[PDB]
Amino acid sequence: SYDRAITVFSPDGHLFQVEYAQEAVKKGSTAVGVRGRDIVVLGVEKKSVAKLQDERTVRKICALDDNVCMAFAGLTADARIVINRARVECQSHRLTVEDPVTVEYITRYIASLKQRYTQSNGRRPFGISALIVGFDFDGTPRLYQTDPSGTYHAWKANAIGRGAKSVREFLEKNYTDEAIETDDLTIKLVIKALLEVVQSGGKNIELAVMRRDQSLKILNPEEIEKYVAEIE
Amino acid sequence: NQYDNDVTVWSPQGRIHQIEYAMEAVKQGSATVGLKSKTHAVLVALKRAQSELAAHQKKILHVDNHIGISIAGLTADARLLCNFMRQECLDSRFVFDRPLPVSRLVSLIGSKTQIPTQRYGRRPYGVGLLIAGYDDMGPHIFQTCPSANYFDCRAMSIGARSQSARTYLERHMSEFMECNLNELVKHGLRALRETLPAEQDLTTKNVSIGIVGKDLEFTIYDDDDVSPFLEGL
Amino acid sequence: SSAGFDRHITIFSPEGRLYQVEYAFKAINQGGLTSVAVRGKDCAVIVTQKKVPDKLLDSSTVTHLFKITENIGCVMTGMTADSRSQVQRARYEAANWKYKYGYEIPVDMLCKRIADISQVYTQNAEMRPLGCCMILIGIDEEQGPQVYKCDPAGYYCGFKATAAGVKQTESTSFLEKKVKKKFDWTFEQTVETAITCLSTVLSIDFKPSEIEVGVVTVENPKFRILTEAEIDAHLVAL
Amino acid sequence: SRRYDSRTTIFSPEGRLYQVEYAMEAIGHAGTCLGILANDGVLLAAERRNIHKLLDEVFFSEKIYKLNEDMACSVAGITSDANVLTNELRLIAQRYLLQYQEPIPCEQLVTALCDIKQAYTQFGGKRPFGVSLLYIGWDKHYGFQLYQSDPSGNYGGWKATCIGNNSAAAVSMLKQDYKEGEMTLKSALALAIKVLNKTMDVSKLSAEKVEIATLTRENGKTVIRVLKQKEVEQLIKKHEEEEAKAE
Amino acid sequence: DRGVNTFSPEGRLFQVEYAIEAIKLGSTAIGIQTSEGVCLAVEKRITSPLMEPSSIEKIVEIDAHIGCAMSGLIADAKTLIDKARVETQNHWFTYNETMTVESVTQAVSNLALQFGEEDADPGAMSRPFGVALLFGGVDEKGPQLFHMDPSGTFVQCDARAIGSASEGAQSSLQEVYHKSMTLKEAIKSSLIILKQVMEEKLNATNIELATVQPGQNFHMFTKEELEEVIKDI
Amino acid sequence: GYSFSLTTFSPSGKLVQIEYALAAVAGGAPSVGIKAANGVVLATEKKQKSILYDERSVHKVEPITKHIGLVYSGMGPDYRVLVHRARKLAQQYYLVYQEPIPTAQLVQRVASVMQEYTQSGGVRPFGVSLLICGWNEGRPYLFQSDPSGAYFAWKATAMGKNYVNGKTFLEKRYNEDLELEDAIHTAILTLKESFEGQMTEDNIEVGICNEAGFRRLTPTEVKDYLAA
Amino acid sequence: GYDLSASTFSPDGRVFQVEYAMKAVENSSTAIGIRCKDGVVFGVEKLVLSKLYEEGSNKRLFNVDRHVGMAVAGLLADARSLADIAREEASNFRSNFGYNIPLKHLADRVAMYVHAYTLYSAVRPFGCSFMLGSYSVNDGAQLYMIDPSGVSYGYWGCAIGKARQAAKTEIEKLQMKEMTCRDIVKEVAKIIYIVHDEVKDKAFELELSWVGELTNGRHEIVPKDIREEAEKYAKESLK
Amino acid sequence: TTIAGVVYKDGIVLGADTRATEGMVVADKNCSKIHFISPNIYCCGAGTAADTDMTTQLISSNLELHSLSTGRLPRVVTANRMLKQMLFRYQGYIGAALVLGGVDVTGPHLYSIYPHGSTDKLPYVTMGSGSLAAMAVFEDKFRPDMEEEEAKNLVSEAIAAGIFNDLGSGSNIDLCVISKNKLDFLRPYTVPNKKGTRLGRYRCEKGTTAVLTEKITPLE
């Protein structure tokens, strides 16, 4: 087996591999999500299509289980391993507890994996950051962001990838209790945040809204454009 | 340049540079001392004061009834090597089913310290040790170098300003043969006072003294139990 | 040239020369000795120098001639630390033949398995190629005398007149000159031929104490060392 | 010993991997291969870099390396690394037959591979795969499929794309000539040569330097048949007649 | 460039010297040991208002009578808190008694400085723990407060200041602390120092308090009871 | 053992290590095979710097199986590794399918063994370019295995020193209608281009593979072919 | 960078890590022994660093087996390492064959273990050099050395310490093969006292042991009665 | 099953039946109990056929590396110490009973290999279920240093003696002859009895069988 020291301490206490892992996800796609009232809205940005690509395989937004659905940004490869692992653990809690997972219990496991690979020998740290949305047994919306350092935090709204700080500035200003009440305004808030970074116009994004009754269904591009003419 | 960063590289002078860097960690730290008399052996350990609010340190551990140890330098490998003696002394009651002679204990520790020195990716234990024990041959005082070398001393001091402490040991060494329970710690206290700064003083709070002997089992004495032993200052 | 780790470990040089193998060629020169062997028809002889610089040395326990098997001896030139390593190995190789395969191992199969171990060194940077060169003699039921050599490079190529050590280069000129006369001086006196080699290039003419000779014959297939008195029997002939 | 380690798994100060960056340079100098997804089926193409005459071909193909009864691949890169990838896919695709007993979907097969391709880019301290290859196949649900697997393990669906040398200008020319839904098995064969003529230095191809295999379904079963040299040469002449009329 | 185990001319062990420098970049936490109990206050350092403060807890419950406090990197902290929760239950596995606070930090400090890059373990730490931990609880010996060194050194501290504000705060703790202080007096006196070192405005939102009493198990103060102390300051 | 690879990609992205591996084969003993209609002829140059060497032991052309044999250009000990491997990979076929192994099958197994030492660390690649020939399904087989592990099907190729110039004479005169007897003549003429010396019956080891199987020619039988 | 590795041989075909380890003996105090008719006498000059050491500490005389003793030189750390290793083949050889291990045998076993560490760079090669000796009916007096590279030579005499080539100068003229065990003690200490350095070094302790017919083939330390005869003879010869 | 062998002047002779019976019912009358080890050395078999089969090829490939690496001819005693080494590892689980014989540089050698690993050296040995009746013939007419035709007459007389006695042997007699140079192997050496000619005709006319469904798939 390969046993070597990859992530080691430096002067001031910085970790190079942990800091360099963030540089990968900051250069990826921009993923934005908002925690609403009865609905959670999440969407990602697509680089390019040019009619030659299958829109199914380029999807960043995935589904860990019925209640919890996770999307990622940045390097796509590493996310494939986590999603394959997490979906196994979505059944593990349903196995023992006989209840679906919460947004925290699926995040702790994903946070625990990133911790182990920022420390243990021979394994490089994940260069990915994910935004996990889901509802509890009571339908309370929850959003827990995962970090490549292995920690996690909660957010009403936040962005990852390119322009994550610029979009966060737009989210703090326009977030109101009236936006989370109206399903439209909740969806419109996410679209306006995604259109700020995109200067090319059109629809470069794949928008998916996950409700309670009839959970999540990915919105068709015509349904996405339906809300573009209203905000234009 | 490329010598100091590897454990198994031999210096052009023929020594191990890593052992030279392993001993410096022991030479810099809290000071401890130990002694042995005819029927008894007494050790004195100074607990370095980091702040007035917090407790100073813990420099002494209980190995077995007839064996005890003081530690210096790093606490990590200290308790590590202690856990060895914890199991080895219990193995003495398992296999031999008697008190383990201290002469054999220094050989087992030496075999444990030599393994990481001879392999790649393994640092030598950076913890100096001072062992006090008793057997049918009488009390003994053994010094454990951070290197695999084993020492046997009548007296010694491990810590900062240990030269002045050894200087005091070069005088009364002849008087250490005949002493009672009071004169034992009497030499030990003033021995530790030589390592203390000129602006400090030896009190009951910063002193920890283990005592093991023929009819006296090893027992750690806190600031309260050392009151009758400091009256000779 | 040396680019990066070429010189430090075993990897392809820009010319693919395997510098570590070339550095092992000069490892035999550290001993400063020389060993020669020449095979006859019904006999085989090994004549090499035994240097005793210190009178405190025990001449019986210090030798380059070791018993390998009943019918096969050996002489080695190089670092004694590397020398003694092949001793137990070649014994492990031959005893595995006598147990599994179940009979006496030929010099060909005994020296072939040695190169299988030596080739492991060239491909692994963890372990260094040994600088010892083995020279074995033995009597075969068909080919008769068998002289095979294993170098640090892993060549089991068999010789007729053998040379080793620092003088291995110039000593061939004495041996290559023998291609005229029949079979490179193949007699029952071949013992005298190998003695002449070492004395010719070094211009010494060793005494009976400085010569050690193993011999295997059709009459005596077992490997045997000759006493200093028996060495003088050949020395008085010249 | 850390002194002799090249540190392949360390991240760059920009967040990349030096071994994965140079892996794309490998396939950049390798042979050019392309593929087209159509309604009637799926095809491929390859530019053989060996023009020597005495070279033979023992078992019908060279770089095709049929993966299973339901699909094959096309590789551009080091032939060595491309040989193990075929050995691994043929196992996993048959491990599907074990665990499933259906035809394996092209989306599921590329998954299990690109997940194994990532391990060498993650742990083990070993160099990654230097082969960026393609897939042609058919499944029960989405039908004919074409995928592109990078050396890093990130794959995506492609209707028309290119790999190997000059894939940049290739794909740029495929955007104009491709049509969604109107691609048949025939017209897609004739369009593939147009790119192969501009990429290759010579004006015309001898059909020996190229190999085209067709994948379609007939009588409820998928049939994979490599086009014979006569079938390729006759199809090249059809493209030669169109070039004379267009000028 | 260097191995996992390397000593300098001091022989610190480089990696720990760099691991301690990571604690100085973490949040500030100050515990206080009084006769009534031990209070723990940790600054959350909320970056943006959209962050939910209820999801971040740097003070977690370990045993019924024993809590936890962390500072610096939280990533490694989420491990030991799961390990310490086992160690507390490991004492219930045998002795059928509440685990002494002394043996808690004592057992958790054993895993400190267990690492290596050569044949150590199919997986294990490639770097030591860069997290500082403050453990506290009330046992039959009374309330106690401990501190953990990345080198594994554990020490009992009446009042300890860690984090980015640790410099200059330990000098302030010596003046304000006494032996007659009650639990409520230590609470208010702690937040006053925390309010000065905080760059933002201290309020019931970003502050986290917990108390342990001999008659009351581990308990936390919600935003209501937190504001009561804020109003008094 | 070092787990990390000793061979990594260049910034150019050609692997460096196997690129320097071709420099080793370019300096080894040349070997030229020829594929004929009824069989295959193999002849290599065995050079011995002195008569002191014994040529009744070392064979550059050694039988792998009954119907398959192997000639090499490159390092001696690296070739010894392959001989033991090529013969054991065939026993994995023989113990299982109880038939003769196709040459196309045996070479592809060697191609996988070539790569394991190029990628995995602690081990260097092989510096030997193999040439394997066999007779199966009534068809001749002549292959060449590069150090990288990419098998190339050849008819008449050239290895060793001046292998680029070796293909010259082969491309000049080569006929597919030739038979086993006619192919032996052209096999010597290729090595006869530049021998840097005088070739004799002991300076060349010839072998053939056909319906009769694989074997080697004694120095006496080769002398008949040395009359030209 | 040829020095750094264990593995490497330098363009001259020389292993530096063994040579760098060989210098560990030249920096160590003198320990010598003499091979006589009825056995072999061991001796060690033990440097006293401080007077606080208990008498008999830092013991350089190891007892390997009933007929085999050990006198170690160089670093005491690696000396004790091969001590217990020498106790392995000692307890092994008798657990299988059932004999007291002949010194020729044991000299082969420990030589492979020392050489096993010179092949790899993952371990540091042992630089210590220790002496072994045995006396038996068949073998008689036997004295062998184990080099830091794993080389084993037979010796009629031994000179090891800070002074090596200078110590064998007086060992050059002995004629001890005409003398018996109890008469070697006067010759041993006589060589030890004259090679001591009174400038850098200050005080030393004399520890002597031998195996012979008077000991019935048992390895034991010389009693103080005969030990005091050293200073009563060898010290008087110093003048 | 009855296998036997003898040692004549210039070589040895092996023999075996063709009858392989599963339980009390005959299975294969074409079965070959004699197997090929090396060109100069062959081996017989008895007991469990499948166990002897695979064991034969396990040792056969091992001698292939031998003969090819050594370049010389394999020896009888060589393969003999392989069988008892492999059978001793299984402590008698494998019921393979083998008879090994051949001509090496030393000369003719014949061995008897028992399942437990016991090996003997004899000029004649008999194994199998009919090893008893077959041994009785060798205990009578065996003469040292016989001729080639004298051995084939003695062996075939012993095998046929067991065939006419033991129930597990018959249907044909197989022999093998190995000399120092020439080699002779005749599978169908002697057929003791042949099947009688059928009197009536059991052939049924086409269409007498009821067929429900029929499918025909063409091929190239």
Numbering used by the authors:
A (entry chain Y): 2 to 233
B (entry chain a): 4 to 236
C (entry chain V): 6 to 243
D (entry chain X): 2 to 248
E (entry chain Z): 9 to 241
F (entry chain W): 4 to 231
G (entry chain b): 6 to 244
H (entry chain B): 1 to 220
Paper text:
In order to better understand how a ubiquitin conjugate enters the proteolytic chamber of the 20S complex, we performed cryo-EM single-particle analysis on purified human 20S proteasomes before and after incubation with MonoUb-Cyclin B1-NT. Discontinuous density in the cis α-ring was particularly notable at the N-termini of α2/α3/α4 subunits that define the gate at the center of the ring. Discontinuous density could reflect potential conformational dynamic variations in the gate region of the affected maps over an area of sufficient dimensions to enable entry of the branched polypeptide at the site of ubiquitin conjugation to Cyclin B1-NT. Careful observation of the models reveals variations in the gate region and in particular to the reverse turn of several α-subunits (located between the N-terminal tail and H0 helix). We note that the reverse turns are key factors in 20S proteasome gate opening. Comparing density maps of 20S complexes with and without substrate also highlighted the flexibility at beta annulus loops in both β-rings. Indeed, we observed binding of a ubiquitinated substrate induced discontinuous density and conformational dynamics in the center of the 20S α-ring of sufficient dimensions to potentially enable simultaneous entry of a few polypeptides.
Three of the seven β subunits in each of the two β-rings that align this proteolytic chamber (β1, β2, and β5) are proteolytically active, and between them hydrolyze most substrate peptide bonds to generate a variety of short peptide products. We show that 20S proteasomes can degrade the ubiquitin tag along with the conjugated substrate.
